[PDB]
Design a protein around this ligand. Structure first.
Ligand code: FMN
Ligand code: SF4
Ligand code: SF4
Ligand code: SF4
Ligand code: FES
Ligand code: FES
Ligand code: K
Lengths: 429, 212, 263, 42, 87
C-alpha cells in the first residue's frame, strides 16, 4: 500500500469508543471481548509473544518501543521473586485523553489485555495505575474487574486455564511525572514519584524490586484482539514498522474536537479534515500543529500539508508521533504564549530530583515569560537554544527532553516572531 | 508553603481518627500489596483520610504513618509531593479549572473569569461562606472536551461562561449537577454526527484467525 | 578470572563485575567530579555532575551509578564530557546565592572548586534567584538552606548511617526543599557528620561559625579520647588556638565519621 | 441502538465508591507473596 | 571530596610553643621550623632525607580508601534491608 486511512468499522478495535453500547461484561462479550481467552492462554507465552511481535505493535505511551521485544524481557525463568505487569493509565500528557475512553467505555478490553499480556510475561498480577483525577473512570474499571472475578475470567484458574491472575487498581494523587514508568513504580511503592536511574531495568528490578513490565493502556488493550485476529492482520495496517491502528485526539482550533480511531500513517491533513471537521476558519487559517502531545515539537502549516501520522514520518519532520494527541493552533493564536504555557506546565510537573530539569526548566520558564512580552534581546534566543540542549540527554528521565523539545520547536520554526516581539517591545520602551 | 507550623487548628494534638468503617477499607487496601511492603499503601490510605476529613492536618499524616509503620517524614514527603492532597482546609466544592494550552486555546480564560465574577473571589481563594475554593490546574486528561473543570470528583466539560454559572447555581442550591459535556454531545465523539463507529459492532469470533 | 577489561581514555584496566564507571576511573587516578555521590552512602545519581561520555555511545552516562561494561572506553576529558560538566555546573549556580564571603564553606567548598576546575568562568543567568527559608534543627548544625544544591547526601546519611528518618524532601520541582517539614531537632550522636558530607555551606557547624577560614588553619592529626574507640581526627588550629575537630579517615575504626561529643 | 449514552452509572458514584469496590474484591484476591520480613526496617 | 592533596608524602616537625605578643596579641614563636613542610614522592625519599639530616622521625603508612561495592539497584531490594525509603 501507499495510501493509508479510511479505516473500516470492522477493523476498528475500540468499538465502544464513544460509550454508545453497554460497557459492562454483557455488552463487552457481545462485541467479542473474552472470546476464546482460554485458548489464547493455553497457546503459551511464547506463542503470545510471537503474535505481538509479528503485529509490529509499538508502545502507545509516547516512546514507541517495539512491544513484542519489550515484553520478551520478562519471558525468562523464575528466580524466586513474583513477576508483575504494571499498566500505565496515568494519562497525563497535555492534549492526550485517549486512555480515558478505553478505561471507562471499554474496560473489559483492558482487563483481558492484562490477563493475556500477564500470561506472556509470567506475571502473577497486574497493577493498573490510574491518575487520581479519573475517579469515575477508575470506579468503572473496578466494576468491570469485579464482573471478571465473578465470572471466573480473572483470579484463580482464570478463564478455566489453570493460570492464577489478579488485577489491582491503584490511584495516583496528582503528578504528571508518575506517568514515567519508573516514577510510576516508585509511586506504587508509596514514595514520591521520582524516576529511577537505569540500569537496573524494570524487567530485572521493578515494582517491589521484582521483574516488571510497564505498558500503556492502549498497548495492553489491543493485545487480546491481536492474538484473536492474528499479528498479520494488525501488520496489514499502516506503513512498514508503523503497523496497526491508532487512537487520535484532535483538540485545539478545530471545528469538532474529538477522539477517533484511524489507521497509522494517515495524512495529518486528512485526519483533521475527515474527522475533526477541519481547522477553525478553514485550512489556510492553520498556523502550527503539535502532532503528538505537548512534548513533541510543533510543526508549521507548510510541513503539515503532506506529513503522515506515524513514528518514522514525524521523526523525519523533526518531531514525533508521541501519544498521537493533535493540538491545532490557527493563525489567531499567540504561538509564543502557547508554547510558554507548556513550559510553565513542565515547570509545575518536574519532580525536582535531578539538576538539569529542576533548575533548567524553571530557567527556561522565566526566559519564555519574557519572550512572550518581548522583554529580551535576540541574542537570548541562541542562549535559550543552548540551555535546552544542556537539559536534553542529561537528565534522569525523559521529562527533561519533553520540556526541551517544545522550546526547540518554537525557535526552529518561529524565530522571526520571537525577534519581531522583541523589536516591538524595545521601540515602545 | 512546604513547611509546617503548628497552629491551634493544625497541630499534632488536633483530633483525627479513622472511622470503624474506614479501618475495614484500610485493611483491604493494605492487602493489595506483598507482605513486607506495607509502605505501598501510603498514597491510598492518605487519600482515604482526605476523603473522611476533607483535608490533611499534620495529625492525619501522623496517624497514617502510625498505622503503616512508616516514619512520619516519609508520609510528609508524599503529602507535599502530590497536588491532590489538601494540607489546608478547602471549600465544600473544590473547583479546578484546567488552563494548559489545549484548554487555553479553547478559551479557558473565559471560564476562569466567569467563575471569579460569580463567586467574587480570585484564583486560590475560598468564599467566605466556605462553599467554594477556586484554583487552576494542569491538563486533566479531557482535552478534546475543553474548556473544562473538575469539581471534587466530577468533570464538567465543553463549558461556556453561562454553563459554568448554572453549575455553580445548582451547587449553591445544594443540588448536584450531572457531569460530562454541556454542548450537546455525550463524551468525546465529534459534534455534528459520528465520523466512525456508525455500524453495529461485529459479534463474537468475527475475524478470528484459524487454529486458535 | 572474573575480572573484565575496560578502558579509561584508552588505558586498559581490569575491574570486578559491578564496578561503576566512576570506580573504574579512580583505578587510573582519575577522580570524576561529583556532588551527590558519596562512597559510604547509597548511590543517588541526581546531581548529574558525573556525566561522562562512553566512546561510540551517543548518550552520556552517570559514572557514579552506571556499571561498567566489558570493552567500554570511558572518555573522561572529551569535548562531550567537558560540555556536560559545564552545563550541569551552570544549572547548579543559577539559583545559588552570592554568599561566598559570608559562607563558612568558602575556601574548602566543592562547589567553588569544581566550578573553577570543571565549570565555565562567567554567568549568562539573567533572572532572579530562588530564596528558601531556614530550618532550625538544633544547636549544633546551622542551616542556610538557600545554599542547598539538593544533593540528598544528608538525607541518605541520616537514614542509612545514623538510622534516623527525620530528613527528607518536601515539595516538587524547583521549589523542592530539604528539611524535616515540621519543626524538629536532628539530635543524634552522629548528627554533626552531616556538616562534613554536605558539599556546600547549607549545613555548617554552629560553634565554628565565622571564626576561621580553611587556608589559614594548621592541621594536627591526632586521636580522640572522648571514648574508647580511638577515633582518628584532625585538630584544626590557628595562631596557637584550637578552632575545630574534624574526622580523619581510618577504615578499621571510625571510617570517616566522629561522634558529636568528639566533634 | 447507537444514539444514547450508556455510561450513566457514574452519575451516582459517591466518595467511597472506589474503596468499597476494592473492599468487595478483597475476598477474590489470591494470597499475596511475602518478602520474608515485616518491612525493610526489620 | 577531592583527593588531590593526598598524593604526595610530607615531612613536618613537632609543634612548639606559641604565645601571645604583649603589644598586639599576635601569635609569637621561637621555633624556626614551625612552618617548614617538605614534599616527597615516596616514603623512602622522605626517610632518606631525614636520615642524612640527622632528624629522628616517625613514619605512618599511607591510608588508602578500600574499594567499595556500589550498586544502584540495591536501593530497591525485594527482601533486603538495603531498600531505601526515600530518594
Ligand atoms: C514525563 C513522562 C510522562 C509520561 N506519561 C505517560 C503516560 O501518562 N502514559 C503512558 O502510557 N506513558 C507515559 N510515559 C511513557 C512511559 O514512561 C513508558 O514509556 C510507557 O508507559 C511504556 O509503555 P508502552 O511501551 O506501551 O508505550 C511518560 C513518560 C514521561 C517521561
Ligand atoms: S528530568 Fe525532571 S522529572 Fe525527570 S527525574 Fe529529573 S527532575 Fe525529575
Ligand atoms: S556553598 Fe560554596 S559556592 Fe556557595 S556561597 Fe558557600 S563557598 Fe560560595
Ligand atoms: S543540605 Fe547539603 S547535604 Fe543536604 S541535600 Fe542540601 S546540599 Fe545536599
Ligand atoms: S489541556 Fe485541559 S484537559 Fe487537557
Ligand atoms: S555524582 Fe553522579 S549524578 Fe551526582
Ligand atoms: K558543609
Amino acid at each position: 500500500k501507499t495510501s493509508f486511512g479510511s479505516l473500516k468499522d470492522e477493523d476498528r478495535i475500540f468499538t465502544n469508543l464513544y460509550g454508545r453500547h453497554d460497557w459492562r461484561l454483557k455488552g463487552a462479550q457481545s462485541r467479542g471481548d473474552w472470546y476464546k481467552t482460554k485458548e489464547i492462554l493455553l497457546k503459551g507465552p511464547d506463542w503470545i509473544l510471537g503474535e505481538v511481535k509479528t503485529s509490529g505493535l509499538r508502545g502507545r505511551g509516547g516512546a514507541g518501543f517495539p512491544t513484542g521485544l519489550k515484553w520478551s524481557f520478562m519471558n525468562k525463568p523464575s528466580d524466586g521473586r513474583p513477576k508483575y505487569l504494571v499498566v500505565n493509565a496515568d494519562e497525563g500528557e497535555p492534549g492526550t485523553c485517549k486512555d480515558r475512553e478505553i478505561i471507562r467505555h471499554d474496560p473489559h478490553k483492558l482487563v483481558e489485555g492484562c490477563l493475556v499480556g500477564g500470561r506472556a510475561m509470567g506475571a502473577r498480577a497486574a497493577y493498573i495505575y490510574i491518575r487520581g483525577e479519573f475517579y469515575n473512570e477508575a470506579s468503572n474499571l473496578q466494576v468491570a474487574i469485579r464482573e471478571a472475578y465473578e465470572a471466573g475470567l480473572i483470579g484463580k484458574n482464570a478463564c478455566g486455564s489453570g493460570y492464577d491472575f489478579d488485577v489491582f487498581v491503584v490511584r495516583g494523587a496528582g503528578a504528571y511525572i508518575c506517568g514515567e514508568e519508573t516514577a510510576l513504580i516508585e509511586s506504587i511503592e508509596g514514595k514520591q514519584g521520582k524516576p529511577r536511574l537505569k540500569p537496573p531495568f524494570p524487567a530485572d528490578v521493578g515494582v517491589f524490586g521484582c521483574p516488571t513490565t510497564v505498558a500503556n493502556v492502549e498497548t495492553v488493550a489491543v493485545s487480546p484482539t491481536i492474538c484473536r485476529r492474528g499479528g498479520a492482520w494488525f501488520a496489514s495496517f499502516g506503513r512498514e514498522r508503523n503497523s496497526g491502528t491508532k487512537l487520535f485526539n484532535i483538540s485545539g482550533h478545530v471545528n469538532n474536537p474529538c477522539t477517533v480511531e484511524e489507521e497509522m500513517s494517515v495524512p495529518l491533513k486528512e485526519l483533521i479534515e475527515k474527522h475533526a471537521g477541519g481547522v477553525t476558519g478553514g485550512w489556510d487559517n492553520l498556523l502550527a500543529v503539535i502532532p503528538g502531545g505537548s512534548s513533541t515539537p510543533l510543526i508549521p502549516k507548510s510541513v503539515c500539508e503532506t506529513v503522515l501520522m506515524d513514528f518514522d514520518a514525524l521523526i523525519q519532520a523533526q518531531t514525533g508521533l508521541g501519544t498521537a494527541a493533535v493540538i491545532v493552533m490557527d493563525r489567531s493564536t499567540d504561538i509564543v504564549k502557547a508554547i510558554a504555557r507548556l513550559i510553565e506546565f513542565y515547570k509545575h510537573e518536574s519532580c525536582g530530583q535531578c539538576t538539569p530539569c529542576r533548575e533548567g526548566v524553571d530557567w527556561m520558564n522565566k526566559v519564555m515569560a519574557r519572550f512572550v512580552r518581548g522583554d529580551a534581546r535576540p541574542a537570548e534566543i541562541d542562549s535559550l537554544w543552548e540551555i535546552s540542549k544542556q537539559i536534553e540527554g542529561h537528565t534522569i528521565c525523559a521529562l527533561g527532553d519533553g520540556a526541551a523539545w517544545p522550546v526547540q520547536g518554537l525557535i526552529r520554526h518561529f524565530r522571526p516572531e520571537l525577534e519581531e516581539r522583541m523589536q516591538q517591545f524595545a521601540q515602545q520602551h | 508553603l512546604f513547611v509546617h507550623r503548628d497552629t491551634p487548628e493544625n497541630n499534632p494534638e488536633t483530633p483525627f481518627d479513622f472511622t470503624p468503617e474506614n479501618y475495614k477499607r484500610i485493611e483491604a487496601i493494605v492487602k493489595n500489596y506483598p507482605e513486607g511492603h506495607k509502605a505501598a499503601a501510603v498514597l491510598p490510605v492518605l487519600d482515604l483520610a482526605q476523603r473522611q476529613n476533607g483535608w490533611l492536618p499534620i495529625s492525619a499524616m501522623n496517624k497514617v504513618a502510625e498505622i503503616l509503620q512508616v516514619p512520619p517524614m516519609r508520609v510528609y514527603e508524599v503529602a507535599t509531593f502530590y497536588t491532590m492532597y489538601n494540607r489546608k482546609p478547602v471549600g465544600k466544592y473544590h473547583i479546578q479549572v484546567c488552563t494548559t494550552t489545549p484548554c487555553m486555546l479553547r478559551n479557558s480564560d473565559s471560564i476562569l473569569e466567569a467563575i471569579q465574577k460569580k463567586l467574587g473571589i480570585k484564583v486560590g481563594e475560598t468564599t467566605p461562606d466556605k462553599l467554594f475554593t477556586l484554583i487552576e490546574v494542569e491538563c486533566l486528561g479531557a482535552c478534546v472536551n475543553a474548556p473544562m473543570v473538575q469539581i471534587n470528583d466530577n468533570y464538567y466539560e465543553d463549558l461556556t461562561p453561562k454553563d459554568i454559572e448554572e453549575i455553580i447555581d445548582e451547587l449553591k442550591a445544594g443540588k448536584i449537577p450531572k457531569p460530562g459535556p454541556r454542548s450537546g454531545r455525550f463524551s468525546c465523539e465529534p459534534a455534528g454526527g459520528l465520523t466512525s463507529l456508525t455500524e453495529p459492532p461485529k459479534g463474537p469470533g468475527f475475524g478470528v484467525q484459524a487454529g486458535l | 578470572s572474573n575480572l573484565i577489561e575496560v578502558f579509561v581514555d584508552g588505558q586498559s584496566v581490569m575491574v570486578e563485575p559491578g564496578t561503576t564507571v566512576l570506580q573504574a576511573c579512580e583505578k587510573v587516578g582519575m577522580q570524576i567530579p561529583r556532588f551527590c555521590y558519596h562512597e559510604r552512602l547509597s548511590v543517588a545519581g541526581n546531581c548529574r555532575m558525573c556525566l561522562v561520555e562512553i566512546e561510540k555511545a551517543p548518550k552520556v552516562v552517570a559514572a557514579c551509578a552506571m556499571p561498567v561494561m566489558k570493552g567500554w572506553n570511558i572518555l573522561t576529558n572529551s569535548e562531550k564530557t567537558k560540555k556536560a560538566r559545564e552545563g550541569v555546573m551552570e544549572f547548579l549556580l543559577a539559583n545559588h546565592p552570592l554568599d561566598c564571603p559570608i559562607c563558612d564553606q568558602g575556601g574548602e567548598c566543592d562547589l567553588q572548586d569544581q566550578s573553577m576546575m570543571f565549570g565555565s568562568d562567567r554567568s549568562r543567568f539573567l533572572e532572579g534567584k530562588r530564596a528558601v527559608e531556614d530550618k532550625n534543627i538544633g544547636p549544633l548544625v546551622k542551616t542556610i538552606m538557600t545554599r542547598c544544591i539538593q544533593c540528598t547526601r544528608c538525607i541518605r546519611f541520616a537514614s542509612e548511617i545514623a538510622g534516623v528518618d527525620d530528613l527528607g524532601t518536601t515539595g516538587r520541582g524547583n521549589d523542592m526543599q530539604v528539611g524535616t517539614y515540621i519543626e524538629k531537632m536532628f539530635m543524634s550522636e552522629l548528627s554533626g557528620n552531616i556538616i562534613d558530607i554536605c558539599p556546600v555551606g547549607a549545613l555548617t557547624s554552629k560553634p565554628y561559625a565565622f571564626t576561621a577560614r580553611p587556608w589559614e588553619t594548621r592541621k594536627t592529626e591526632s586521636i580522640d579520647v572522648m571514648d574508647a574507640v580511638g577515633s582518628n581526627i584532625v585538630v584544626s588550629t590557628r595562631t596557637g588556638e584550637v578552632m575545630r575537630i574534624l574526622p580523619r579517615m581510618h577504615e578499621d575504626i571510625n571510617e570517616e565519621w566522629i561522634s558529636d561529643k568528639t566533634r | 441502538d447507537n444514539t444514547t449514552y450508556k455510561n450513566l452509572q457514574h452519575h451516582d458514584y459517591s466518595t467511597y465508591t472506589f474503596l468499597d469496590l476494592n473492599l468487595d474484591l478483597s475476598k477474590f484476591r489470591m494470597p499475596q507473596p511475602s518478602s520474608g520480613r515485616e518491612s525493610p526496617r526489620h | 571530596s577531592g583527593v588531590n592533596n593526598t598524593k604526595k608524602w610530607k615531612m613536618e616537625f613537632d609543634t612548639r610553643e606559641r604565645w601571645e605578643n604583649p603589644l598586639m596579641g599576635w601569635a609569637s614563636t621561637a621555633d624556626p621550623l614551625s612552618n617548614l613542610v617538605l614534599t616527597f614522592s615516596t616514603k623512602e625519599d622522605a626517610v632518606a632525607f631525614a636520615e642524612k639530616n640527622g632528624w629522628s622521625y616517625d613514619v605512618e603508612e599511607r591510608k588508602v580508601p578500600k574499594p567499595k561495592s556500589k550498586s544502584y539497584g540495591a536501593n530497591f531490594s525485594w527482601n533486603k534491608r538495603t531498600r531505601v525509603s526515600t530518594k
